[PDB]
GROMACS .gro file of N, CA and C in nm:
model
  279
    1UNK      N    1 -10.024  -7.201  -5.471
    1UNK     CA    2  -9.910  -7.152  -5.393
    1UNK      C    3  -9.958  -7.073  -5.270
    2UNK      N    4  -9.848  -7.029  -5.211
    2UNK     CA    5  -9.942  -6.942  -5.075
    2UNK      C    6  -9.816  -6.816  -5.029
    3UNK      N    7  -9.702  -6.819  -5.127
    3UNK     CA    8  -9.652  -6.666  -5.169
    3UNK      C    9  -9.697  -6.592  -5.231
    4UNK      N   10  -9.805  -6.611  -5.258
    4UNK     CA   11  -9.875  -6.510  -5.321
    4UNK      C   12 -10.003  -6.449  -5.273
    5UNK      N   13 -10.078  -6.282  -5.301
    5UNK     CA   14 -10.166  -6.300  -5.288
    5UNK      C   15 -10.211  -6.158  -5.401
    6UNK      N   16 -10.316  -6.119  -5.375
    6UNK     CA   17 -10.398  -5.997  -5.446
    6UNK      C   18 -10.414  -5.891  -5.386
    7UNK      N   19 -10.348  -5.791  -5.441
    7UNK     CA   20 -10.314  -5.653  -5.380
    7UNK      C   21 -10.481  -5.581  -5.445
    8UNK      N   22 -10.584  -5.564  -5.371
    8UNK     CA   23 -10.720  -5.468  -5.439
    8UNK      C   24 -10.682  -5.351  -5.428
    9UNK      N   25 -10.712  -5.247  -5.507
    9UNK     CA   26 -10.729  -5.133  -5.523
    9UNK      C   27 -10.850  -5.069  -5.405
   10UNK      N   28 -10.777  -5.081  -5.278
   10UNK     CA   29 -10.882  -5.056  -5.151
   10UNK      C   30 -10.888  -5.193  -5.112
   11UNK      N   31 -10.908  -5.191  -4.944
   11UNK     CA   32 -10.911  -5.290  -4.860
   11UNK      C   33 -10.804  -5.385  -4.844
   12UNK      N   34 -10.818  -5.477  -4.737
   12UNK     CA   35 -10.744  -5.545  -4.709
   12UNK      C   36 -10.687  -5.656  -4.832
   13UNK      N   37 -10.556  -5.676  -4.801
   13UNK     CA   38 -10.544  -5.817  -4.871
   13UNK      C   39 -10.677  -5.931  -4.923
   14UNK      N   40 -10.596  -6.019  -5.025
   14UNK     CA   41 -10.693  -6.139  -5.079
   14UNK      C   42 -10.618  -6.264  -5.082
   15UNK      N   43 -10.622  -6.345  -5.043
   15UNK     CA   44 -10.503  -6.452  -5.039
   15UNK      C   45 -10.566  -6.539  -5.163
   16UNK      N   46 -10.460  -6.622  -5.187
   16UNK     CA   47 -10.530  -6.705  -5.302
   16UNK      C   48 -10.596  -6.825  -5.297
   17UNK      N   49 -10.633  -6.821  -5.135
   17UNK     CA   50 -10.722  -6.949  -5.122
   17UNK      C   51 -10.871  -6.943  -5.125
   18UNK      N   52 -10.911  -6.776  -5.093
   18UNK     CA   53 -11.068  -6.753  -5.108
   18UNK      C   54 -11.092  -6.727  -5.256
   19UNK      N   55 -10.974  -6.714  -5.387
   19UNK     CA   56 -11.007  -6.658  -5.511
   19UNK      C   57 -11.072  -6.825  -5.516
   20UNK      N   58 -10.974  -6.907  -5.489
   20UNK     CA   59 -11.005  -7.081  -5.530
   20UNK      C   60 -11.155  -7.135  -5.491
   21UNK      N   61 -11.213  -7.070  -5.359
   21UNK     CA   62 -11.338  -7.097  -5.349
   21UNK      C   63 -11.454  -7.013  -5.407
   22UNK      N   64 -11.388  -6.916  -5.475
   22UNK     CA   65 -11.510  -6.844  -5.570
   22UNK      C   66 -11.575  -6.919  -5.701
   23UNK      N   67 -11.432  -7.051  -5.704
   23UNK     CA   68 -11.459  -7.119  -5.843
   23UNK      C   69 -11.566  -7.227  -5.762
   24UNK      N   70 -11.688  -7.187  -5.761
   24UNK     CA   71 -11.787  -7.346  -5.776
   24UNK      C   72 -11.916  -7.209  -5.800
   25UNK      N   73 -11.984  -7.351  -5.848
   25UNK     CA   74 -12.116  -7.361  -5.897
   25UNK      C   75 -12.201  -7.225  -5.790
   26UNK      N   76 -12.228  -7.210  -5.687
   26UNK     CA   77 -12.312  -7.153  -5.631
   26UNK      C   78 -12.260  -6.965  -5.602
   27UNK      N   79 -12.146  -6.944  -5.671
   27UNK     CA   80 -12.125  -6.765  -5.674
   27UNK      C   81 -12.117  -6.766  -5.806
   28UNK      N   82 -12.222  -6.853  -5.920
   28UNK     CA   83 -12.224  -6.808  -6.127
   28UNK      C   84 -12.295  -6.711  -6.072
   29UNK      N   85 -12.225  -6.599  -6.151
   29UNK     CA   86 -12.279  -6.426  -6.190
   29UNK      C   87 -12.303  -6.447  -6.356
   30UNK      N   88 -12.426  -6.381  -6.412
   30UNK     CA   89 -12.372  -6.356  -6.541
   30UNK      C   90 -12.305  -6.256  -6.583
   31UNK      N   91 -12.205  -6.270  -6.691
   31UNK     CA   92 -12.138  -6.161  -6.709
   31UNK      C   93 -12.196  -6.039  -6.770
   32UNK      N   94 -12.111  -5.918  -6.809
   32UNK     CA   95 -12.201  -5.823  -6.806
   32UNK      C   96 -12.085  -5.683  -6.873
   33UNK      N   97 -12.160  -5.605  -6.956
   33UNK     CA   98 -12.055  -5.527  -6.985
   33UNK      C   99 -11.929  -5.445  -6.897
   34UNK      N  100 -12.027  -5.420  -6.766
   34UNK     CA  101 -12.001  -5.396  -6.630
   34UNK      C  102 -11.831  -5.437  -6.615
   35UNK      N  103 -11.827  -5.559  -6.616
   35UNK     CA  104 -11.738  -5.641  -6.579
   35UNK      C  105 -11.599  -5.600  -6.635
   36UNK      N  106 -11.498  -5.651  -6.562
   36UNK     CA  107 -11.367  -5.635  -6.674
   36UNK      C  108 -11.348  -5.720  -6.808
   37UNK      N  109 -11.293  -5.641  -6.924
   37UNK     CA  110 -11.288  -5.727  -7.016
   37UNK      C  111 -11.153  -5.814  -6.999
   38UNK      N  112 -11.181  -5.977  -7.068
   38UNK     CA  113 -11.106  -6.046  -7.069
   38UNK      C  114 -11.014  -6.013  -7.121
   39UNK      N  115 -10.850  -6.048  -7.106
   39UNK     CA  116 -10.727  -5.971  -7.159
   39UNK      C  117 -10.680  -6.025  -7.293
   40UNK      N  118 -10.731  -6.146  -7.283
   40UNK     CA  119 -10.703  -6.252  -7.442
   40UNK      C  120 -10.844  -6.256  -7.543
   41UNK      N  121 -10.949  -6.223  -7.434
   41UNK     CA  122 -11.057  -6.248  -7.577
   41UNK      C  123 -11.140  -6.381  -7.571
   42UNK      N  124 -11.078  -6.505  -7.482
   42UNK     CA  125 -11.151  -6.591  -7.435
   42UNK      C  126 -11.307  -6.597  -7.385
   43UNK      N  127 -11.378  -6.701  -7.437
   43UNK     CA  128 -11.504  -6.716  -7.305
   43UNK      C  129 -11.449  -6.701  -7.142
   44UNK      N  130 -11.558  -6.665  -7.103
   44UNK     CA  131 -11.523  -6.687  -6.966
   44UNK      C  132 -11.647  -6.687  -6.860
   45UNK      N  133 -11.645  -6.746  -6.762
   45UNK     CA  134 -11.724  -6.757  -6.626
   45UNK      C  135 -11.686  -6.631  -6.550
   46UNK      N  136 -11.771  -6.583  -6.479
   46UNK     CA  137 -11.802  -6.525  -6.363
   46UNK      C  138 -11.826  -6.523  -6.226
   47UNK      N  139 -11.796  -6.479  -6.103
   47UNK     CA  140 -11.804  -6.533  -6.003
   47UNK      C  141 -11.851  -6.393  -5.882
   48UNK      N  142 -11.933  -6.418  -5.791
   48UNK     CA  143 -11.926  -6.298  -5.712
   48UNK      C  144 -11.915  -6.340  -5.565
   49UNK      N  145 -11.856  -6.256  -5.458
   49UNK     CA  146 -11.825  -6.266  -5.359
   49UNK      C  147 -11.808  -6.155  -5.267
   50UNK      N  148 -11.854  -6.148  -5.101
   50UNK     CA  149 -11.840  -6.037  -5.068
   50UNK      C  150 -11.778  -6.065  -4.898
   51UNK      N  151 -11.693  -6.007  -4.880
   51UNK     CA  152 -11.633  -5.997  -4.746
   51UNK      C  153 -11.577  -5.870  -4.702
   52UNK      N  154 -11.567  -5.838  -4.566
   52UNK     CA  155 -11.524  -5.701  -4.537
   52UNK      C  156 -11.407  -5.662  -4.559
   53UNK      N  157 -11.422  -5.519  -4.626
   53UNK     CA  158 -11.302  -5.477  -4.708
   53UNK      C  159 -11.177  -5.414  -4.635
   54UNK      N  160 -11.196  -5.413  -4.553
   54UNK     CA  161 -11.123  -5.408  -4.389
   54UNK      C  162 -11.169  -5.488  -4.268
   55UNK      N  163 -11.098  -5.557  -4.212
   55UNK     CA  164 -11.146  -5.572  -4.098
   55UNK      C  165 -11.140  -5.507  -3.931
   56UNK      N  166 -11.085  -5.411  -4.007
   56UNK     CA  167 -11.066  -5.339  -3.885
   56UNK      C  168 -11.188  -5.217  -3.864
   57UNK      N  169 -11.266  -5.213  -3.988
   57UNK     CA  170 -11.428  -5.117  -3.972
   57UNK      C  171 -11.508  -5.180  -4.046
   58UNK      N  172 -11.618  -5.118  -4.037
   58UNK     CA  173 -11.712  -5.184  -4.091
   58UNK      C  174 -11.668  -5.182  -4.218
   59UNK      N  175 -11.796  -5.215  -4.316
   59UNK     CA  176 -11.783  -5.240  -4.450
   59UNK      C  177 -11.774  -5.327  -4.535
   60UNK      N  178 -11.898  -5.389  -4.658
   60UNK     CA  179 -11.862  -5.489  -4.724
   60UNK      C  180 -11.816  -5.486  -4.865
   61UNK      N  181 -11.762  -5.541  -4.916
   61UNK     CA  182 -11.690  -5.505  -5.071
   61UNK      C  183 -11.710  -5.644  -5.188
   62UNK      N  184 -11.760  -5.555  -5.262
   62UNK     CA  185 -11.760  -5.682  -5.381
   62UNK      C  186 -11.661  -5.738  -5.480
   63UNK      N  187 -11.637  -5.817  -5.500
   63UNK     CA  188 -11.546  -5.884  -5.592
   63UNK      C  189 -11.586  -5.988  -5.701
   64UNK      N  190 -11.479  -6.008  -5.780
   64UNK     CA  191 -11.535  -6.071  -5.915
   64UNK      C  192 -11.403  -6.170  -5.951
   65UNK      N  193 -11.416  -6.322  -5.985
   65UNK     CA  194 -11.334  -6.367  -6.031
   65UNK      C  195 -11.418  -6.410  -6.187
   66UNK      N  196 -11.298  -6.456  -6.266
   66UNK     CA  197 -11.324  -6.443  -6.415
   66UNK      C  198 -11.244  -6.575  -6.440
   67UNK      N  199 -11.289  -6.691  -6.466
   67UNK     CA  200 -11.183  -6.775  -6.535
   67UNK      C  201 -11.242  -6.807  -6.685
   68UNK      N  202 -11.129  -6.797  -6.763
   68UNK     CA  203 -11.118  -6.824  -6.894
   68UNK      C  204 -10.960  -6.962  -6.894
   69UNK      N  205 -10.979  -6.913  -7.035
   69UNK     CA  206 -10.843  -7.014  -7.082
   69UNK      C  207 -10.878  -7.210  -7.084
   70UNK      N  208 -10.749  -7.271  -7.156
   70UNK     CA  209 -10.767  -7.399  -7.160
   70UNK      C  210 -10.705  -7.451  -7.025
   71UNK      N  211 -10.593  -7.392  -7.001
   71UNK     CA  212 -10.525  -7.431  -6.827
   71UNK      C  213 -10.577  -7.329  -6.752
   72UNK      N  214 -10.727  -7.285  -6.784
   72UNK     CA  215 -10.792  -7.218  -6.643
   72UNK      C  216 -10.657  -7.081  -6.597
   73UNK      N  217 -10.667  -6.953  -6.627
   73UNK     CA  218 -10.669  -6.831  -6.594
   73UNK      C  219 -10.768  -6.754  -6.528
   74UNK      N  220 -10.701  -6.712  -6.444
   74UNK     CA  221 -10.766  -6.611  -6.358
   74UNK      C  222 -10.783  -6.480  -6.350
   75UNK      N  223 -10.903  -6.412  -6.320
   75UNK     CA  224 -10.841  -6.287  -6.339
   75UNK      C  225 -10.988  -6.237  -6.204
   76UNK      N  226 -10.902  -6.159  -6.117
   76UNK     CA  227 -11.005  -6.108  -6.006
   76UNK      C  228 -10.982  -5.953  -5.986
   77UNK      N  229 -11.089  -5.922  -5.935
   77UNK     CA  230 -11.166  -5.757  -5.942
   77UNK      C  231 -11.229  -5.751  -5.832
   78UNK      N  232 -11.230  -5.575  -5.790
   78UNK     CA  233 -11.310  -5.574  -5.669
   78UNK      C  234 -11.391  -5.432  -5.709
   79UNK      N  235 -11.518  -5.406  -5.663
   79UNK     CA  236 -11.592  -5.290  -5.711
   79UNK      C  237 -11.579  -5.184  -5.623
   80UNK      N  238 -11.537  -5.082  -5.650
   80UNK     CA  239 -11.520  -4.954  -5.630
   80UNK      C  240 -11.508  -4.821  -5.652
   81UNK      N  241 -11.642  -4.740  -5.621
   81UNK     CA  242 -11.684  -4.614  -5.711
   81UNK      C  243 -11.716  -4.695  -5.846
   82UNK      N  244 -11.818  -4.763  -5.811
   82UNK     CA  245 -11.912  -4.807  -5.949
   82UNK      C  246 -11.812  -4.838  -6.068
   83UNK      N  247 -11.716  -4.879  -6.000
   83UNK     CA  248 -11.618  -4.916  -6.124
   83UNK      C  249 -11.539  -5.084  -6.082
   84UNK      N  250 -11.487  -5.154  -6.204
   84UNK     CA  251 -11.457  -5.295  -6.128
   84UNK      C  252 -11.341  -5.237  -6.162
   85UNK      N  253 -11.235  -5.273  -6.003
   85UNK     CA  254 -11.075  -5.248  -6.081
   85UNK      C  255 -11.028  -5.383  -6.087
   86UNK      N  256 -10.952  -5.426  -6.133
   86UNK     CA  257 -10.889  -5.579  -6.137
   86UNK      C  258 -10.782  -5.547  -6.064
   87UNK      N  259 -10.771  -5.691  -5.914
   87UNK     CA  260 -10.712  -5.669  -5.839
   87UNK      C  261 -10.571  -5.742  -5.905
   88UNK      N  262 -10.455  -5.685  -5.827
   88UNK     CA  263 -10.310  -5.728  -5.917
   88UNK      C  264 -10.265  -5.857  -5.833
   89UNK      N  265 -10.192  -5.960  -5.904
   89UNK     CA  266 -10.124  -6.050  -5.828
   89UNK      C  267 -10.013  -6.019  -5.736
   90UNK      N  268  -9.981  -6.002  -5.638
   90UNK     CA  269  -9.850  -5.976  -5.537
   90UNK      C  270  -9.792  -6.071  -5.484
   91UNK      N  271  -9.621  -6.060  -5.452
   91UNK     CA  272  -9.562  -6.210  -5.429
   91UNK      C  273  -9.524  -6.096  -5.273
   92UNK      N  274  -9.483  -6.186  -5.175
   92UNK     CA  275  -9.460  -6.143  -5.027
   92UNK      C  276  -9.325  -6.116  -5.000
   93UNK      N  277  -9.294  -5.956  -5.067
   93UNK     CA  278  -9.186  -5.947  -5.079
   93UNK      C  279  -9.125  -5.788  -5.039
   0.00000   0.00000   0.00000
């Protein structure tokens, strides 16, 4: 969809077309206690990615997508103060 996007806890917006390119082969992270725990308990993949967390100053910010599930769930995070917060889904409203 493209009413939607990811509100991070800090920085700019996340639309849901860069979460979609976190899913391939070349951003596997292994997972790590670090990480957020999964909300169901599923296996899951890892993903890492970094773009500026504003673009209006400097600064780069890390993020984490997580897919689990049989119809593929998502779940994305961004690191801040040594902590991962999981970023929330937002509709444009």
């Amino acid at each position: 969809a493209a009413n939607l996007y990811y509100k991070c806890d800090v920085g700019d917006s996340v639309n849901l077309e860069e979460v979609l390119n976190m899913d391939c082969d070349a951003a596997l992270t292994e997972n790590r206690d670090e990480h957020p725990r999964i909300p169901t308990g599923e296996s899951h993949k890892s993903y890492f990615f970094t773009k500026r967390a504003c673009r209006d100053r400097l600064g780069l910010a890390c993020y984490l997508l997580q897919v689990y599930g049989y119809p593929k769930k998502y779940q994305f995070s961004q690191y801040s103060n040594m902590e991962w917060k999981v970023c929330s889904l937002q509709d444009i409203r």
